[PDB]
Design a protein around this ligand. Sequence first.
Ligand SMILES: O=C(O)[C@@H]1CN(c2ncnc3[nH]c4cc(F)ccc4c23)CC12CCC2
Length: 167
Amino acid sequence: VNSFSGYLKLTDNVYIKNADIVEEAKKVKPTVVVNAANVYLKHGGGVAGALNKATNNAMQVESDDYIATNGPLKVGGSCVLSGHNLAKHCLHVVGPNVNKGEDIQLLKSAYENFNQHEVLLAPLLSAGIFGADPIHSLRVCVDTVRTNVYLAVFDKNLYDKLVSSFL
Ligand SMILES: O=C(O)[C@@H]1CN(c2ncnc3[nH]c4cc(F)ccc4c23)CC12CCC2
């Protein structure tokens, strides 16, 4: 038993809800919240900009130190940093950004990072400003992640489309 509430169950291990991930994180304090990161951990907009704003820019300060030490992530890769006031940990995961021409097949590699964590609160990778089809992203999530994932979908309209079209 865990503290996630109001989710629709899609499969044995994937759950979905219409929610703001920042507010969902603020209430649940999950062990892991996933950020839709870029390779530079520049949290300017989308989910990343919203998560970072909710931390009062502490996520960005920590991220800049991480990059200064380690260099950029790989597309499809991840790193674990603090969850600040939102979660114990933040798993920063880089999905391919279609608006940069990155290979959508890397989306599966991105979701594989979730399997290193037993339970996660997450957005749909490569959705939103990353330019991928959120329905495809949901399919890859379901077919790749084996751990327990609670997906927060900000837009009520898209949520209904994702549920109604789910096979
Ligand atoms: O940034 C993107 O392209 C979208 C944003 N989406 C979100 N999903 C779940 N909660 C969210 N709260 C927010 C608050 C904001 F101010 C901006 C975006 C969100 C948001 C998923 C996405 C595809 C992977 C990242």
